[PDB]
């Protein structure tokens with residue numbers, strides 16, 4: 379079984395957990411799929427291969443409309459290839475923030491789907507452990523679309539990335555008992571309870587300035603309904619949340635029994651019988667939450683991509699140098715492609731051609747490979763820079779064009795950028811800052827925070 383014999387890469391879907399997800403296509407049937415590629419080297423394995431193989435085989439036989447469908451599994455010297463069904467509706471919360479109105483009925487429908495998928499998985503002795511909004515995909519970008527839970531069962535066999543770009547946002551959802559090391563399927567009920575709390579209020583129940591702060595709250599396990607917007611919420615919803623966020627797991631309600639709860643039964647009726655006031659403050663809060671999380675993540679990815687492009691700028695120049703037997707610094711289309719491939723090893727024809735368009739539109743002769751290197755790398759870093767700008771713009775909901783010092787403290791705390799470190803970098807960028815930054819200044823800060 380060779381992965382590449384069956385599937386061709388089409389386009390990247392993202393970096394998710396444990397590795398990158400690539401949209402692939404079956405070479406024979408044309409069938410599209412999402413393949414999670416996990417590098418055995420860059421990621422450690424918890425269990426022996428036999429245990430992993432058995433769990434994979436089980437997963438292939440399981441089917442539920444709220445669980446991502448696993449089709450196939452491949453392995454080579456370097457990697458595991460997990461072939462799943464592709465879902466195109468994006469992350470649940472990125473949908474929710476676009477909505478104009480949101481009620482308890484909406485929240486209930488969402489949670490019943492999650493609880494349903496979880497219950498089926500627990501029946502089969504599969505635990506998630508890292509349940510969070512990022513792991514709730516939509517079959518289509520619509521409030522009517524079905525939810526598919528991704529990454530069930532991965533945490534049992536693979537160690538999580540300790541890189542903060544990977545870690546962002548994880549602290550809010552993790553069960554206290556996971557932190558302390560003794561856990562079972564009840565941890566997934568806890569995470570779901572955290573998600574329900576956020577849907578109804580727009581604010582995490584366990585919150586803080588940074589990762590440790592948040593984890594400290596989770597561990598203590600104390601939370602409240604003190605916020606004003608909890609006045610608009612039914613006692614029934616609050617009651618379920620209490621049961622889901624019960625500290626001791628044996629006393630914590632099960633996924634199965636949570637489906638049976640009065641709130642779920644009452645509010646997921648096809649026919650809306652009960653009062654449905656729009657949880658307007660929760661929406662505003664949820665948008666603020668998502669925006670913050672997305673900007674912090676984009677910031678780390680941007681800094682990461684900057685460093686990566688620095689390495690690859692040096693390598694690419696070295697490679698072309700060797701090829702530059704003449705020493706005139708000019709190469710042809712063939713040579714440029716070959717070198718690009720050399721670096722890649724360290725589709726192709728088309729990417730070089732895009733570069734040459736800008737460089738030498740007429741294509742009359744040879745190319746200053748130096749000029750090529752520059753343009754080539756800028757196209758590689760585009761996604762991250764535009765994504766950064768988009769996240770900045772989205773976070774800036776009033777279109778002020780600026781982010782305040784208070785907002786920066788939140789963004790950087792979530793990002794594990796030390797308070798004293800970022801403030802010092804701000805001072806270097808703008809001596810006369812007024813306790814706010816525009817986009818360019820923010821970007822200048824990030825550059826300085828990654829050795830630039």
Ligand SMILES: COc1ccc2cc(-c3nn(CC4CCNCC4)c4ncnc(N)c34)ccc2c1
Nearest residue numbers: 391392394399412414460462463464465528529
């Ligand atoms: C255990 O075997 C498998 C096999 C394939 C899997 C595919 C996905 C998956 N990831 N992404 C990228 C999104 C980018 C935005 N943030 C949320 C995720 C996806 N996008 C669309 N469809 C998908 N199926 C995924 C996740 C886990 C998988 C596990």
